[PDB]
Design a binder for this molecule. Structure first.
Ligand SMILES: CCCCCCCC/C=C\CCCCCCCC(=O)OC[C@H](COP(=O)(O)OCCN)OC(=O)CCCCCCC/C=C\CCCCCCCC
Ligand SMILES: CCCCCCCC/C=C\CCCCCCCC(=O)OC[C@H](COP(=O)(O)OCCN)OC(=O)CCCCCCC/C=C\CCCCCCCC
Ligand SMILES: CCCCCCCC/C=C\CCCCCCCC(=O)OC[C@H](COP(=O)(O)OCCN)OC(=O)CCCCCCC/C=C\CCCCCCCC
Ligand code: HEC
Ligand code: HEM
Ligand code: HEM
Ligand code: HEM
Ligand code: HEM
Ligand SMILES: CCCCCCC[C@H]1C(=O)O[C@H](C)[C@H](NC(=O)c2cccc(NC=O)c2O)C(=O)O[C@@H](C)[C@@H]1OC(=O)[C@H](C)CC
Ligand SMILES: CCCCCCC[C@H]1C(=O)O[C@H](C)[C@H](NC(=O)c2cccc(NC=O)c2O)C(=O)O[C@@H](C)[C@@H]1OC(=O)[C@H](C)CC
Ligand SMILES: C/C=C(C)/C=C/C=C/[C@H](OC)[C@@H](C)[C@@H](OC)[C@@H](C)CCc1oc2c(O)c(OC)cc(OC)c2c(=O)c1C
Ligand SMILES: C/C=C(C)/C=C/C=C/[C@H](OC)[C@@H](C)[C@@H](OC)[C@@H](C)CCc1oc2c(O)c(OC)cc(OC)c2c(=O)c1C
Ligand SMILES: CCCCCCO[C@@H]1O[C@H](CO)[C@@H](O)[C@H](O)[C@H]1O
Ligand SMILES: CCCCCCO[C@@H]1O[C@H](CO)[C@@H](O)[C@H](O)[C@H]1O
Ligand SMILES: CCCCCCO[C@@H]1O[C@H](CO)[C@@H](O)[C@H](O)[C@H]1O
Ligand SMILES: CCCCCCO[C@@H]1O[C@H](CO)[C@@H](O)[C@H](O)[C@H]1O
Ligand code: FES
Lengths: 49, 241, 32, 49, 73, 365, 365, 96, 74
């Protein structure tokens, strides 16, 4: 997180740069980082899965 | 004493080679373990998820798991905490360790029941006979405090007091909870617990038998076919004279 | 007509021999 | 027979029943300050919030 | 070891039929059973006795063990 | 091909000659199921037993692979004993090299099965590992040191289980190599046959005659294995190994795997430590002496009635020993076991060689 | 033996022909130290790393066995690359069967070393296992399914480590068998020599000439291995594997074992997933193509000046790729790595075959 | 491990007895405290990494058993780090 | 492959001395060094250049990397 040329993320294994949306912008990765199913709760929290 | 009393053979509905377990009986048996045996015996290798599709729906098993509280963590503060159980949790252990188990049972150790039916000669015939076999000591026999007379237990002196009796629990389907009924059901549940692959191996067994019934005679015919050349050959010795 | 027929026929025989004992047979009592 | 036996062994290498026991995960959003990427272990994989 | 270099054989004639020209189970029972009986009678005197002995020692020994643990044999 | 196809084979070998291939099949079966079990098994004493229950409860078809491995071991021994019996009865042991490698194979499989039985870490596992390794303590001056070296400590513990997994893993492959040598030596002579008479004048191609018989045999072996696995998986096992190892308590009716019972009875028959261990070792190694004890002018027992009776007496005696090995050390079993043990050695060392000489005189040679 | 003693050998082979035996020695050394490590190693993710520290700290001489195994793996690759290099330069690849088996051996050793590196479960272990297995996810439609099948779950976890121990244990023995076939094929033709000209008119007995040279080589190999083990055991290793695996964090400067660096650089040079994986695979599999790319009328490069220059350019290029594989993905390394990658394939597929044709014309044939 | 390296056996026994380590369960099934002994491993300051971070503003002090092998530079790095703290340069602002 | 069945050779005479009749290191230096120099000078033009190139690319690339990270006053 916070590494790379787009303030998002930088993968050290082979140079993949993602933005703060998790979208791939540079490097060898083919897809944007995955988004799982989730819902926010009545206790301010979030339930993923 | 060194005398031995072997259990008789009960006609379990799952005794036959192609006979499956009675799942309603497994369901009732689970209730017996949950309400009665679990207070002293662990069942370390069975989890709530294992009950799904066997004797309870997924929703029912989830509800059963939520009935207990299990430790989890550590949390962000490095603390362990309690939470409602869930399908992935294994049945709760009544004691943290065998030492405590013995301390709570006059020195005797209630064994884990996950494999009890496979870990004892006689299997459910032994467990059923044991559960329904308590009686008063024969004349001349005096047991030390904490021990009960059971003709089916090796040595005849067991550290477990009769765990079941009429109405020890109420079944979810109304089945009269007589001692023998309760024993019959918990033994069936214990069979499933020790051998969950039980029904499937027998189904596969039937298919194996049907396939061998086909292939063996055919391959044998192939054998006889090839060998017929040798089996009917004739020899003649014609030395010059 | 082997694996399909063979498997279905054997399963049928198995279930018949064990009618009312299998989960698929009592399932309806507890189950959208 | 052979197809059945081979697929059973191959099947044994697939995720065992305890691995498929999964479950969702509840996260406390307040514990995560603005600007912070927090990694959580959800199914042996990182979960970024 | 190879066919052609095994041993020396002279003056022997062998006649054979294709497997397709004959039965795979000729007289399977009308002859099979009688030969099985012959082969059985032919060995039983050599094979059976020792096992009959085992059987006896087993039953005697087992019963002896039982009686020995009782109050009044 | 030079292991199949055009290999010349006697025209008259019987089904007793099928066990060699069944042994090869048992070995491949064990290696395959074994490798798949090793993909899930962990050898730490704290997790061994649990990992096995995990295999049987949660791994897809883990239960069938596990029980096929367990019962496969039993089928392996049934085949081994039939194979050795065939050799003794028909005088196949005169192929000295093939036979002696054969003895090595028997000993290696026993060692392999012993170590495998230790892996699940049940009560039989722990005490079997204790007793069998201690056999070495019978060796003068260095016995005790050898045992502790093997254990990796002063008692069976963690270090023991981990190295046993490693030994059990590799030994089967060594067995496979040794088996191939067993066959290379046999090919130099070709097979023996029921009459014991050279069959060079009547050989037939291995294929299709014995390739088809071997397949039929394979099918029957598989039928027997699966009848056990699918209808009676615990029939040949011990209930006590379903209980985790407890180093402070030896089960009161502890007994060896069925295929080791005869040897156990022999060892138990001698009220002397070194004497029992020597008798145990000799009960197997005597196989290497059989060729030297052959007195008959004929190779096979087919034409030797007296030898035949003694042979079956030896089989009945091994059955007697197997039965005794499964009974408590009490009267009258103690005496029967001692008589059976003595008869075993008396039959092999004295009675059979003597009968051979008697038979020779009766035929005037 | 006919594997030694009276085996005819060229009178003129140089030390570059010593690597075959050194490879056999590396394999035996890895098998021996490996078996001894397996006697103490446990594959449970909770105890793997600890069992390795236990080996190095409390097992008698456990540390020397452990580091001999680690550095032995490195010596194995140094020898492999020298062996292959010799083959390419001297045209030994024209022994097609021997060469192709050789390619299989290279691939199997790589796979074996990869899995071995995963066993201690350090950070490099966990991420190497993650990245390398995921190479399969590049396969259209079923890639992802294959990866999860290999892992035994949705991520690298307990099931993965346990099966990797099993695979790592057995593969080396398979390698030994394949190596013996490598040699059986070579014996059919006998060895090539520096001139590339048939040496049937001047053969000498393997013993004593090459048995003594092989021993001298073995001594030098052992010297090199022990200099590493006793004076610089971590020199060729990565400090990051001394940190337990953390599935939530990939070290920022993570990099492959040194012998995989050139291949890593090639894969990293392609900003496309499938393209990089294909280039990776081809970087090794191209060895199987070399025989088909041979254009010279002469077998060896000994008498081919242009081919020699290109050969050394290829070596310098692999050294270049190795260096780049060890640097961050930043300018100017990204461009140098891409040029180096292109040159690698350009040299093997175009420049060398072309030079062979040019040399042919210069000699008028 | 200290015995014969930098302390005598008696000295190491004394060093171990300076700490109280958990043991058991006893005959009542209870865990208890006892003086440390040669076979015990050095006490852990925290029961788990979560607690360690909680006590160090979210930072996790790593185990030091292999720190010198787990870091490029080895002891040169650790020594430089330990003796290298200084005030932040101009323009650098560090969080609490 | 076995001695006696390798190939056909005619009219060649070979003379040899027992190893015990000779020196194991004849002129080891007075000749060894000169031959090593010959063999070195004979290959260096084929072997060395590519590595000199590697060396150059390495030093240039490394220095270029360093320079690139140094503050570019903006
Ligand atoms: C190695 C050879 C051993 C053969 C083992 C045979 C076996 O495992 O059985 C496979 C299979 C049984 O049916 P399944 O479709 O697999 O079971 C699902 C039922 N709902 O078929 C056979 O038994 C083949 C005959 C042998
Ligand atoms: C190891 C200890 C294991 C425990 C022992 C259990 C033994 C149980 C007994 C099973 C034996 C059943 C087989 C009986 C076969 C009956 C039969 O056909 O006998 C007669 C028949 C006649 O054949 P021919 O003389 O060639 O003439 C043919 C005329 N047409 O004889 C045979 O078939 C001979 C075959 C002998 C092999 C039998 C081997 C049985 C096992 C013995 C164990 C081996 C000994 C040593 C091992 C310990 C180390
Ligand atoms: C894989 C990637 C690994 C990283 C690469 C690192 C490479 C480091 C370079 C080490 C090379 C040192 C050896 C230099 C030897 C110098 C020398 O003597 O050259 C001249 C000399 C002259 O011999 P002749 O033509 O037969 O005539 C004899 C006249 N009396 O040539 C030779 O000795 C040829 C020997 C060639 C073998 C060298 C192999 C080096 C390694 C290369 C890797 C192999 C390639 C493919 C592997 C990747 C898959
Ligand atoms: C605590 C009050 C108990 C309850 C409730 C039940 N059991 Fe128990 N059981 C208990 C003890 C202390 C022991 C040890 C006995 C000894 O002297 O060793 C046992 C033992 C058993 C056994 C094992 C018998 C054997 O062969 O070793 C079985 C099969 C058994 N118990 C079954 C069982 C079942 C099914 C129960 C619920 C119906 C049950 N027990 C309850 C203590 C207690
Ligand atoms: C892993 C175990 C073994 C394998 C795989 C094996 C395999 C074989 C095979 C394939 C044959 C040929 C077919 C046959 O005649 O059965 C054979 C023959 C033989 N084997 Fe074994 N064997 C094994 C163990 C042994 C043992 C324990 C002995 C004896 C102590 C032995 C003694 C012999 C002999 C003497 C023959 C020749 C039989 C004859 O032609 O009459 N074998 N074996
Ligand atoms: C000659 C071949 C072999 C024999 C006779 C043999 C025998 C056995 C026996 C008797 C057991 C105990 C079974 C039980 O009751 O649980 C066992 C366990 C085991 N074997 Fe083998 N085995 C063989 C080959 C192999 C091979 C090749 C491997 C691994 C590459 C292997 C892996 C295992 C494993 C992991 C266990 C423990 C799990 C279990 O108990 O089932 N075995 N083996
Ligand atoms: C476990 C790995 C390997 C072992 C044990 C091995 C062993 C051997 C041995 C003993 C020789 C004869 C001595 C020598 O010339 O060095 C040989 C020759 C050879 N090997 Fe390998 N090798 C291995 C891998 C490979 C690889 C990776 C290749 C190539 C892709 C290969 C290609 C060859 C060829 C072509 C020859 C003939 C050399 C000549 O006579 O010019 N080998 N190998
Ligand atoms: C072609 C042969 C082999 C190669 C190239 C090889 C390579 C490796 C590598 C690279 C490691 C990691 C070393 C480290 O940094 O810790 C490793 C670990 C290991 N290997 Fe092997 N290995 C070979 C054969 C074997 C064999 C035959 C066994 C077992 C019978 C074995 C058992 C082990 C064990 C237990 C470990 C984990 C302990 C450790 O990390 O040192 N290896 N191997
Ligand atoms: C490559 C080919 C190698 C093939 C190796 C196998 C082989 O040689 O196969 C053969 C058919 C062999 N069988 C015989 O020699 C044989 C001889 C006489 C009669 C019968 N059967 C009835 O009368 C036989 O079955 C037999 O069963 O051996 C296995 C034991 C071998 O397997 C092994 O050694 C490993 C376990 C491997
Ligand atoms: C045991 C007996 C079998 C012998 C097997 C071993 C063998 O055949 O040994 C040989 C000497 C062989 N070496 C050669 O053929 C050879 C040929 C030409 C030149 C040199 N050396 C200089 O010019 C050689 O060293 C060599 O080193 O191979 C090993 C790789 C083999 O080892 C294996 O295959 C295993 C891995 C086991
Ligand atoms: C590191 C490897 C080592 C040390 C391997 C050594 C193997 C030795 C032999 O194989 C070659 C050995 C297995 C073989 O002896 C010929 C068997 C017939 C031994 C039979 C045997 O089994 C027992 C057994 O299984 C038990 O289980 C619960 C318990 C036992 O008594 C309590 C015995 C026992 O009293 C005997 C004699
Ligand atoms: C179940 C068994 C399986 C799946 C085996 C498959 C084996 C595949 C190949 O061997 C045949 C493979 C090892 C071989 O490819 C030709 C190597 C050169 C791959 C080189 C390689 O290494 C890396 C590595 O080591 C790392 O460590 C920390 C990290 C890595 O990136 C972050 C890599 C990497 O990016 C590459 C390309
Ligand atoms: C089967 C019935 C046999 C009678 C044996 C019971 O014995 C009794 O068990 C009690 C357990 O709480 C002890 O407290 C008591 O002292 C003891 O005498
Ligand atoms: C194929 C016929 C084998 C003989 C059947 C009996 O088998 C025996 O059964 C006993 C009780 O179940 C077991 O304790 C014993 O280990 C087993 O060998
Ligand atoms: C196979 C022959 C059966 C063995 C008969 C054993 O017989 C027993 O021998 C004991 C020896 O002390 C006697 O004390 C005992 O009274 C006697 O019945
Ligand atoms: C024979 C001398 C080879 C050069 C030794 C350098 O070796 C390298 O050092 C790096 C850190 O400096 C490590 O990260 C890397 O894994 C290691 O292979
Ligand atoms: S795994 Fe992220 S760049 Fe390759």
């Amino acid at each position: 997180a916070n590494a790379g040329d787009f303030g998002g993320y930088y993968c050290p294994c082979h140079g993949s740069h993602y933005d703060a949306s998790g979208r791939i912008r540079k490097g060898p990765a083919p897809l944007n980082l995955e988004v799982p199913s989730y819902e926010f709760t009545s206790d301010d929290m979030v339930i993923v899965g | 004493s060194d005398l031995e009393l072997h259990p008789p053979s009960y006609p379990w509905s799952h005794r036959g080679l192609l006979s499956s377990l009675d799942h309603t009986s497994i369901r009732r048996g689970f209730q017996v373990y949950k309400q009665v045996c679990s207070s002293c015996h662990s069942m370390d290798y069975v989890a709530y998820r294992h009950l799904v599709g066997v004797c309870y729906t997924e929703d029912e098993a989830k509800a059963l798991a939520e009935e207990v509280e299990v430790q989890d963590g550590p949390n962000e503060d490095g603390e362990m905490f309690m939470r409602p159980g869930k399908l992935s949790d294994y049945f709760p252990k009544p004691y943290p360790n065998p030492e405590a188990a013995r301390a709570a049972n006059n020195g005797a150790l209630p064994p884990d029941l996950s494999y009890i039916v496979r870990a004892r000669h006689g299997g459910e015939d032994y467990v059923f006979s044991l559960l329904t076999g308590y009686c008063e000591p024969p004349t001349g026999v005096s047991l030390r405090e904490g021990l009960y007379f059971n003709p089916y237990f090796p040595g005849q002196a067991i550290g477990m007091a009769p765990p079941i009796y009429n109405e020890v629990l109420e079944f979810d389907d109304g089945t009269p909870a007589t001692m023998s009924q309760v024993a019959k059901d918990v033994c069936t549940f214990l069979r499933w617990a020790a051998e969950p692959e039980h029904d499937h191996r027998k189904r596969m067994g039937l298919k194996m038998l049907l396939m061998m019934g086909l292939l063996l005679p055919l391959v044998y015919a192939m054998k006889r076919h090839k060998w017929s050349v040798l089996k009917s050959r004739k020899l003649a010795y014609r030395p010059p004279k | 007509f082997f694996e399909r027929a063979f498997d279905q026929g054997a399963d049928a025989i198995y279930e018949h021999i064990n009618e009312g004992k299998l989960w698929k047979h009592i399932k309806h009592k507890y189950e959208k | 027979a052979a197809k059945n036996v081979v697929s059973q062994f191959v099947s044994s290498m697939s995720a065992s029943a305890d691995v498929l026991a999964m479950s969702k995960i509840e996260i406390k959003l307040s514990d995560i300050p603005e600007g912070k990427n927090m990694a959580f272990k959800w199914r042996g994989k990182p979960l970024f919030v | 070891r190879q066919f052609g270099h095994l041993t020396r054989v002279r003056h022997v004639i062998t006649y054979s039929l294709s497997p397709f020209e004959q039965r795979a189970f000729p007289h399977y029972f009308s002859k099979g059973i009688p030969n099985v009986l012959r082969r059985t009678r032919a060995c039983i005197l050599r094979v059976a006795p020792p096992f009959v002995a085992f059987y006896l020692v087993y039953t005697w020994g087992t019963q002896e063990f039982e009686k020995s643990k009782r109050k009044n044999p | 091909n030079n292991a199949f196809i055009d290999l010349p084979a006697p025209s008259n070998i019987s089904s007793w000659w099928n066990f060699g291939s069944l042994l090869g099949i048992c070995l491949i079966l064990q290696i395959l199921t074994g490798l798949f079990l090793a993909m899930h098994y962990t050898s730490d004493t704290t997790t061994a037993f649990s990992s096995v229950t995990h295999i049987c409860r949660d791994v897809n078809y883990g239960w069938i692979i596990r029980y096929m491995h367990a019962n496969g071991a039993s089928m392996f021994f049934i085949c081994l004993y039939m194979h050795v019996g065939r050799g003794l009865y028909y005088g196949s042991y005169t192929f000295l090299e093939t036979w002696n490698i054969g003895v090595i194979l028997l000993l290696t499989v026993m060692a392999t099965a012993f170590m495998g039985y230790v892996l699940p870490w049940g009560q039989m596992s722990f005490w079997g590992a204790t007793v069998i390794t201690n056999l070495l303590s019978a060796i003068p001056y260095i016995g005790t040191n050898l045992v502790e070296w093997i254990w990796g400590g002063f008692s069976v513990d963690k270090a023991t289980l981990t190295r046993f997994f490693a030994f059990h893993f590799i030994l089967p492959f060594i067995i496979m190599a040794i088996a191939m040598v067993h066959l290379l030596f046999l090919h130099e002579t070709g097979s023996n046959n029921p009459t014991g008479i050279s069959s060079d004048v009547d050989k037939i191609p291995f294929h299709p005659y014995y390739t088809i018989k071997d397949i039929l045999g394979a099918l029957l072996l598989i039928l027997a294995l699966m009848l056990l696995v699918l209808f009676a998986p615990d029939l040949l096992g011990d209930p006590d190994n379903y209980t985790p190892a407890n180093p402070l308590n030896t089960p009161p009716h502890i007994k060896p795997e069925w295929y080791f019972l005869f040897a156990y009875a022999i060892l138990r028959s001698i009220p002397n430590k070194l004497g029992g261990v020597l008798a145990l070792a000799f009960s197997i190694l005597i196989l290497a002496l059989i060729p030297l004890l052959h007195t008959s002018k004929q190779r096979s027992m087919m034409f030797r009635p007296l030898s035949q009776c003694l042979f079956w007496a030896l089989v009945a005696d091994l059955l007697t020993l197997t039965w005794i090995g499964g009974q408590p050390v009490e009267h009258p079993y103690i005496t029967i076991g001692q008589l059976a043990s003595v008869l075993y050695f008396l039959l092999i060392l004295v009675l059979m060689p003597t009968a051979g000489t008697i038979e020779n005189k009766l035929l005037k040679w």
